[PDB]
Amino acid sequence: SKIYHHPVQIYYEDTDHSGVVYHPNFLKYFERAREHVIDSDKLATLWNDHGLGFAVYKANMIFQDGVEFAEICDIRTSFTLDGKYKTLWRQEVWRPGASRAAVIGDIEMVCLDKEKRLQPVPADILASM
Amino acid sequence: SKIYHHPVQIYYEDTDHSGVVYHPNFLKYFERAREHVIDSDKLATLWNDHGLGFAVYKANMIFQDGVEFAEICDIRTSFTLDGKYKTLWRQEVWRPGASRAAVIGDIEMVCLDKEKRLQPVPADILASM
Amino acid sequence: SKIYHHPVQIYYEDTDHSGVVYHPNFLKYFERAREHVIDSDKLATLWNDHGLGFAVYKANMIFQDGVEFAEICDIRTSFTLDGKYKTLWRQEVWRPGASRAAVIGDIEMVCLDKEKRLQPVPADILASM
Amino acid sequence: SKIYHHPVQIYYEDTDHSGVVYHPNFLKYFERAREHVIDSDKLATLWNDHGLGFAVYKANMIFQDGVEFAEICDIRTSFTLDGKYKTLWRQEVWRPGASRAAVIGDIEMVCLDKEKRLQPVPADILASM
Ligand SMILES: [Mg+2]
Ligand SMILES: [Mg+2]
Ligand SMILES: [Mg+2]
Numbered sequence: 001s002k003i004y005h006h007p008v009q010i011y012y013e014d015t016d017h018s019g020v021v022y023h024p025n026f027l028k029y030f031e032r033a034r035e036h037v038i039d040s041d042k043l044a045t046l047w048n049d050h051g052l053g054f055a056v057y058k059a060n061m062i063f064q065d066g067v068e069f070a071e072i073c074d075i076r077t078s079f080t081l082d083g084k085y086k087t088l089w090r091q092e093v094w095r096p097g098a099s100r101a102a103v104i105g106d107i108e109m110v111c112l113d114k115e116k117r118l119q120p121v122p123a124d125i126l127a128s129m
Numbered sequence: 130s131k132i133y134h135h136p137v138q139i140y141y142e143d144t145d146h147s148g149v150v151y152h153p154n155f156l157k158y159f160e161r162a163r164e165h166v167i168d169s170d171k172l173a174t175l176w177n178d179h180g181l182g183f184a185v186y187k188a189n190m191i192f193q194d195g196v197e198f199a200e201i202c203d204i205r206t207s208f209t210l211d212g213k214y215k216t217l218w219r220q221e222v223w224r225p226g227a228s229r230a231a232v233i234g235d236i237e238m239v240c241l242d243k244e245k246r247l248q249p250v251p252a253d254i255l256a257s258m
Numbered sequence: 259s260k261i262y263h264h265p266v267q268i269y270y271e272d273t274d275h276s277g278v279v280y281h282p283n284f285l286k287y288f289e290r291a292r293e294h295v296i297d298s299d300k301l302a303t304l305w306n307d308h309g310l311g312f313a314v315y316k317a318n319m320i321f322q323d324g325v326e327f328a329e330i331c332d333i334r335t336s337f338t339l340d341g342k343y344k345t346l347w348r349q350e351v352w353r354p355g356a357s358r359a360a361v362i363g364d365i366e367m368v369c370l371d372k373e374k375r376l377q378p379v380p381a382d383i384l385a386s387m
Numbered sequence: 388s389k390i391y392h393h394p395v396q397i398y399y400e401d402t403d404h405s406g407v408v409y410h411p412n413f414l415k416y417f418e419r420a421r422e423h424v425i426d427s428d429k430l431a432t433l434w435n436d437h438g439l440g441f442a443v444y445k446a447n448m449i450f451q452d453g454v455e456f457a458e459i460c461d462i463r464t465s466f467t468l469d470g471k472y473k474t475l476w477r478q479e480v481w482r483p484g485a486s487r488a489a490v491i492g493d494i495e496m497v498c499l500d501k502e503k504r505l506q507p508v509p510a511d512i513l514a515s516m
């Protein structure tokens with residue numbers, strides 16, 4: 001895919017008392033950013049037409065710098081097809097002008113039927129990206 | 130009802146960078162405490178036998194003191210029936226030995242059918258409390 | 259003040275398994291919207307120049323309709339000064355074209371010194387709104 | 388270390404509308420469980436006596452099964468020392484009687500000074516485990 005961009009602002013809800021973003025939250029921001037790549041309409045169409053859904057199977061996170069209250073960051077997201085069944089997503093939290101990401105995620109998503117068996121990703125949901 | 134007690138420990142997820150529990154979280158703790166009064170089995174039975182569910186209609190919160198990281202507090206919960214349709218819950222966050230609550234909530238819950246019409250609370254779900 | 263507008267999109271993180279936004283989350287959205295009215299720079303200036311901060315003292319919520327996954331709503335926020343010490347905020351979650359709010363909050367905020375005593379809100383933090 | 392156990396109950400706050408625990412939440416539960424291994428008193432002592440804190444550097448998650456509303460699970464946690472600076476934590480969400488974990492996390496934590504340089508973990512914070 002191309003690199004998608006999704007802005008995230010850090011609010012009170014995002015920080016803990018150590019004074020930085022509470023680390024589990026980054027996976028939430030990554031999930032949000034993915035919802036802008038494969039939106040709810042696409043997911044609903046996949047479910048109704050094909051009986052398929054995507055699930056996160058693995059998420060490997062590297063936390064490289066603390067992020068403060070009131071920062072606006074850019075979530076950079078791209079994915080590749082890995083065979084018929086799996087999508088591998090690279091997601092990164094960036095600051096303007098930085099030379100490296102604050103947080104990196106490698107996310108593996110599988111395409112499952114209602115019997116929780118792997119099924120090929122249909123061509124139509126992939127087509128726009 | 131009687132006064133129910135539910136312990137809550139304050140973890141990193143609960144605080145913000147101002148150094149106290151992030152205020153929207155108290156309503157979560159109140160919801161948890163209510164799940165110990167009317168558990169999931171009772172809710173499921175209500176839904177399946179009667180087609181009814183409870184919804185929070187109003188929540189009035191008073192935040193009287195900040196709560197710090199790593200505190201263990203006691204959520205005190207009681208409710209009264211208000212007519213046929215409504216339950217009024219008093220919920221309070223307490224510290225050991227305090228003379229007043231840290232946080233107070235008055236919560237009004239309604240009993241709704243699938244048409245979102247008010248319906249009487251059945252006698253069976255109330256009986257144990 | 260004037261009516262401020264803040265968009266909120268409903269993601270997976272926002273819903274529960276009953277199929278609507280989990281009610282404590284609305285107070286979070288209200289907090290976000292307030293951060294766009296009195297931003298972090300203003301708060302920091304208040305703290306450093308005056309030794310003052312704002313705290314939510316009371317929040318009275320009415321939940322009038324369920325909000326679904328993937329909705330985009332408009333948070334409408336306005337406030338009034340109530341004497342020297344207190345700000346009263348009206349916040350509402352709206353859908354496009356609706357005639358009434360999905361969720362209403364009346365929020366009372368106090369202006370406190372480090373001794374947790376009420377102090378007058380300085381003219382400068384109010385001036386732009 | 389030995390295997391520590393920490394119970395987690397799944398409440399409304401934990402699920403999303405797909406009907407299972409929202410995946411970023413598992414890292415929160417893992418953080419909680421770690422707070423029962425190295426409690427706030429130990430962390431505070433480390434900070435004040437040594438000027439050191441722990442940070443999560445990497446978290447590798449495998450999501451092997453969906454977890455439903457109202458389940459009670461057991462978080463199993465153990466760690467090993469990896470050289471002088473790093474602790475490697477294995478954390479797992481288990482159901483009673485299962486033969487495999489629902490969710491697995493491998494978490495790498497580093498011991499940092501205020502200059503964000505790696506420093507040896509002191510013997511005293513490790514001693515009880
Ligand atoms: Mg198709
Ligand atoms: Mg019955
Ligand atoms: Mg001034």
Ligand SMILES: [Mg+2]
Nearest residue numbers: 436437509511
């Ligand atoms: Mg020492």
